[PDB]
Design a binder for these strands. Structure first.
Length: 89
DNA sequence: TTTTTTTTTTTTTTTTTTTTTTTTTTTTTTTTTTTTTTTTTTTTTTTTTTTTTTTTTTTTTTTTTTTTTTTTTTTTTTTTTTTTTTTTTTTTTTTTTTTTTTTTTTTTTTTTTTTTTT
């Protein structure tokens, strides 16, 4: 409600947050985009992998879990944008 | 208000690589054919007393050609070296034991929908 009420202060705070995010992004290591597992294309990755939507590394995670039951428990609750799961045996 | 620069994913189809279906050659495997072993009995072979006329060894002496013999010069034998094979320490790898962590499959039964063939 406060953000909707105060446009100028909200814009100033958003500018500060964007500057902080840019400062965080500048220091990261150089990299390149990577294909991710998807419905239309699998990219030759395992069936057990439950990959994420984010194509950029440094904004994605891989959770190495112990089995298929733990894999399902972690896959049900996660963030599909960043987090991926690869259940071992 | 019109007009100008740049950015990427698509019209893409062709080159490279990968994956997936194939069928010549040395190593297994089932068959027939030839080496082994145990019984019957069977004429047949073979073990053992008696007699007998034989034909080769032992009295005695003879010689000659194999046994004496010495010596030259070869040539098999032995020495060193190195290579090839055999054989045994050494190491590596794999399997089994019993409590732990993880998973993965094949079929019945009915009813309805896709998904190919005719």
């Amino acid at each position: 409600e406060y953000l909707l009420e105060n446009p100028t202060d909200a814009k100033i705070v958003v500018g500060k947050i964007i500057d902080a995010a840019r400062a965080r992004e500048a220091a990261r290591r150089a990299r390149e985009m990577t294909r991710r597992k998807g419905a239309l294309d699998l990219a030759g990755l395992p069936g057990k992998l439950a990959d994420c939507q984010e194509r950029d590394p440094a904004l994605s995670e891989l959770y190495l879990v112990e089995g298929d039951s733990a894999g399902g428990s972690a896959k049900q609750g996660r963030n599909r944008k960043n987090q991926a799961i690869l259940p071992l045996k």
